[PDB]
Design a protein around this motif. Structure first.
Motif, short mmCIF file in Angstrom:
data_model
loop_
_atom_site.label_atom_id
_atom_site.label_comp_id
_atom_site.label_asym_id
_atom_site.label_seq_id
_atom_site.Cartn_x
_atom_site.Cartn_y
_atom_site.Cartn_z
N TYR A 92 0.80 -1.22 0.00
CA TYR A 92 0.00 0.00 0.00
C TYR A 92 0.84 1.27 0.00
O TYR A 92 1.81 1.40 0.74
CB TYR A 92 -0.94 0.02 1.21
CG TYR A 92 -1.84 1.23 1.25
CD1 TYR A 92 -2.82 1.43 0.27
CD2 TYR A 92 -1.72 2.18 2.27
CE1 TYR A 92 -3.66 2.55 0.31
CE2 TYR A 92 -2.55 3.29 2.31
CZ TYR A 92 -3.52 3.47 1.34
OH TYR A 92 -4.33 4.58 1.39
N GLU A 93 0.43 2.23 -0.83
CA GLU A 93 1.11 3.50 -0.97
C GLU A 93 0.07 4.59 -1.28
O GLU A 93 -0.79 4.39 -2.11
CB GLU A 93 2.13 3.37 -2.08
CG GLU A 93 2.77 4.65 -2.56
CD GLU A 93 2.00 5.31 -3.70
OE1 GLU A 93 1.41 4.57 -4.52
OE2 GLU A 93 2.01 6.56 -3.78
N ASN A 94 0.15 5.72 -0.59
CA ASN A 94 -0.81 6.82 -0.77
C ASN A 94 -0.11 8.18 -0.65
O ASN A 94 0.25 8.61 0.44
CB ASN A 94 -1.91 6.69 0.30
CG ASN A 94 -2.95 7.78 0.21
OD1 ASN A 94 -3.56 7.98 -0.84
ND2 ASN A 94 -3.16 8.48 1.32
N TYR A 118 -1.11 8.03 11.48
CA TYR A 118 -1.01 7.42 10.17
C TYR A 118 -2.32 7.66 9.44
O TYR A 118 -2.34 8.09 8.29
CB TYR A 118 -0.78 5.92 10.32
CG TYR A 118 -0.82 5.17 9.02
CD1 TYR A 118 0.29 5.14 8.18
CD2 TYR A 118 -1.96 4.46 8.64
CE1 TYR A 118 0.28 4.42 6.99
CE2 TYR A 118 -1.99 3.73 7.45
CZ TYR A 118 -0.86 3.71 6.63
OH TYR A 118 -0.86 2.97 5.46
N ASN A 119 -3.43 7.40 10.11
CA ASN A 119 -4.73 7.56 9.48
C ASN A 119 -5.09 8.98 9.08
O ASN A 119 -5.72 9.19 8.05
CB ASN A 119 -5.83 6.99 10.39
CG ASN A 119 -7.09 6.68 9.61
OD1 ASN A 119 -8.14 7.32 9.80
ND2 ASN A 119 -7.00 5.70 8.70
N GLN A 120 -4.70 9.95 9.91
CA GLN A 120 -4.98 11.34 9.59
C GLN A 120 -4.22 11.69 8.29
O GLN A 120 -4.77 12.31 7.39
CB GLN A 120 -4.57 12.26 10.75
CG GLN A 120 -4.63 13.75 10.43
CD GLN A 120 -4.29 14.64 11.63
OE1 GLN A 120 -3.44 14.31 12.44
NE2 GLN A 120 -4.96 15.80 11.72
N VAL A 121 -2.97 11.26 8.20
CA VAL A 121 -2.16 11.55 7.02
C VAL A 121 -2.79 10.92 5.78
O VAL A 121 -2.78 11.50 4.70
CB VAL A 121 -0.71 11.02 7.18
CG1 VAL A 121 0.04 11.11 5.86
CG2 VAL A 121 0.02 11.82 8.24
N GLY A 127 3.02 11.61 1.90
CA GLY A 127 2.01 10.57 1.94
C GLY A 127 2.29 9.53 3.01
O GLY A 127 3.03 9.80 3.96
N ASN A 128 1.70 8.35 2.86
CA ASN A 128 1.91 7.27 3.81
C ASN A 128 1.97 5.96 3.06
O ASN A 128 1.60 5.90 1.89
CB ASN A 128 0.77 7.23 4.84
CG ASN A 128 -0.59 7.19 4.19
OD1 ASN A 128 -1.01 8.16 3.56
ND2 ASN A 128 -1.29 6.07 4.35
N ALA A 129 2.44 4.92 3.74
CA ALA A 129 2.55 3.60 3.13
C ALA A 129 2.57 2.52 4.19
O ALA A 129 2.75 2.79 5.37
CB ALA A 129 3.81 3.52 2.27
N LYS A 178 4.04 3.54 7.72
CA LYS A 178 5.16 4.42 7.40
C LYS A 178 4.68 5.76 6.84
O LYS A 178 3.57 5.87 6.33
CB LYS A 178 6.07 3.77 6.34
CG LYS A 178 6.42 2.30 6.56
CD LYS A 178 7.24 2.09 7.81
CE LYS A 178 7.68 0.64 7.93
NZ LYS A 178 8.40 0.40 9.21
N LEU A 179 5.53 6.77 6.93
CA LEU A 179 5.23 8.08 6.37
C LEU A 179 6.27 8.36 5.29
O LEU A 179 7.43 8.00 5.41
CB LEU A 179 5.32 9.17 7.43
CG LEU A 179 4.27 9.17 8.55
CD1 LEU A 179 4.44 10.40 9.42
CD2 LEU A 179 2.88 9.16 7.95
N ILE A 180 5.83 8.97 4.20
CA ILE A 180 6.72 9.32 3.11
C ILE A 180 6.86 10.82 3.22
O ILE A 180 5.87 11.53 3.37
CB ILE A 180 6.10 8.96 1.75
CG1 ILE A 180 5.84 7.45 1.68
CG2 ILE A 180 7.01 9.43 0.64
CD1 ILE A 180 5.19 6.98 0.41
#
Length: 346
Positions: free
Chosen positions: A173-175, A258-261, A295-297, A304-306
């Motif tokens: 997963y990547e967002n 993580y969810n807020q991001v 983003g996040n992953a 994780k945070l990107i």
């Protein structure tokens, strides 16, 4: 007959060795996806350590990440949270991070038959080769921008302690913000906030007209082009600037979840990271460095945070539940809050 790196010892906590082994492949694949790169065979080189000129050893471990024989990334294992800076190397918890930290620099001389020492001071990282010291990565901060060049001499005491070497070569997963893109790099000014906002604004407004210089110029229209690189940015200014750009920026304490991001990223809302050295006082939210969340992953089933550090030409990925950003001079900056740019309200 390849490159070797001087270190005090080649020993690494079993805990760290296992983490790196368990996660390097996943982190490498995720960053390749982000950097629009074609996957390949990933391998972990041998971990090296970094040192201050006075001999103090950086508290983290750096592993070269090799792809089809070439060093393309660096996996960094560092203390996960403030609480960890008090524990020992064996007992502290470590975060896992991936970025292109000096990967190009090591790759270019990976086959050369010599040795180097990876050094660091307030202004960045260096390589000591054949008795000569050269800058490999600059880390400009509001506090070193207008300071004289530090003594670039390797302490005789460091030389006594460097008793071995390691070889970098030795083996869902990547967002993200769809329009985010690195267009400029900070390397000779203290405009970290400006660099972060320009990239975020360019991403959330799908444009390319914003840049660090122009933002700083807007905040200080009376400062000369030669003193501009030294002027710093502050929360109040960021908020005020965003307003003029159609964004209701709000300060939010702590590390966003993580969810807020995940949600904010899907809403196309930018998040700027505010961090400050843990060498200062914790109850004194003062800008030390600013970054941009991209983003996040989820890698190997962990959040994780990107994000993007203005000093880099590529993104970084790190444990979402870590609140420490490990920079130069063996400093750890705590992520104390953020600037979230919501849409203005009608």
């Amino acid at each position: 007959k390849q490159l070797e790196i001087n270190v005090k010892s080649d020993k690494v906590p079993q805990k760290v060795k296992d983490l790196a082994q368990q996660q390097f492949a996943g982190y490498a694949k995720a960053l390749d996806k982000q950097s629009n790169a074609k996957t390949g065979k990933y391998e972990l080189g041998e971990a090296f350590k970094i040192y201050k000129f006075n001999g103090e050893e950086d508290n983290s471990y750096y592993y070269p990440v090799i792809k089809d024989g070439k060093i393309v990334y660096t996996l960094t294992l560092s203390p996960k949270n403030k609480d960890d800076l008090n524990k020992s190397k064996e007992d502290m918890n470590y975060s896992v991070k991936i970025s292109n930290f000096i990967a190009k620099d090591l790759d270019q001389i990976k086959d050369k038959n010599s040795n180097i020492t990876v050094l660091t001071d307030e202004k960045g990282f260096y390589f000591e080769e054949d008795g000569k010291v050269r800058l490999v990565k600059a880390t400009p901060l509001a506090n070193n921008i207008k300071e004289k060049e530090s003594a670039k001499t390797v302490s005789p005491q460091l030389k006594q302690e460097l008793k071995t070497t390691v070889t970098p070569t030795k083996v869902q997963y990547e967002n993200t913000l769809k329009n985010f893109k690195i267009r400029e790099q900070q390397f000779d000014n203290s405009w970290c906030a400006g660099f972060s906002m320009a990239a975020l604004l360019n991403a959330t407004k799908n444009t390319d007209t914003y840049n660090a210089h122009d933002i700083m110029r807007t905040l200080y229209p009376e400062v000369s082009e030669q003193d501009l690189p030294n002027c710093a940015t502050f929360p109040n200014q960021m908020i005020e600037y965003g307003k003029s750009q159609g964004r209701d920026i709000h300060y939010q304490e702590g590390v966003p979840s993580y969810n807020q991001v995940d949600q904010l990223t899907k809403d196309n809302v930018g998040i700027m990271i505010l961090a400050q050295s843990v060498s200062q006082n914790p109850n004194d939210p003062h800008l030390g460095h600013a970054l941009a969340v991209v983003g996040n992953a989820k890698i190997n089933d962990q959040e994780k945070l990107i994000y993007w550090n203005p000093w880099d030409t590529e993104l970084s990925i790190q444990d979402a539940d870590s609140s420490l950003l490990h920079l130069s001079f063996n400093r750890d900056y705590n992520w104390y809050g953020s600037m979230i740019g919501y849409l203005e309200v009608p």
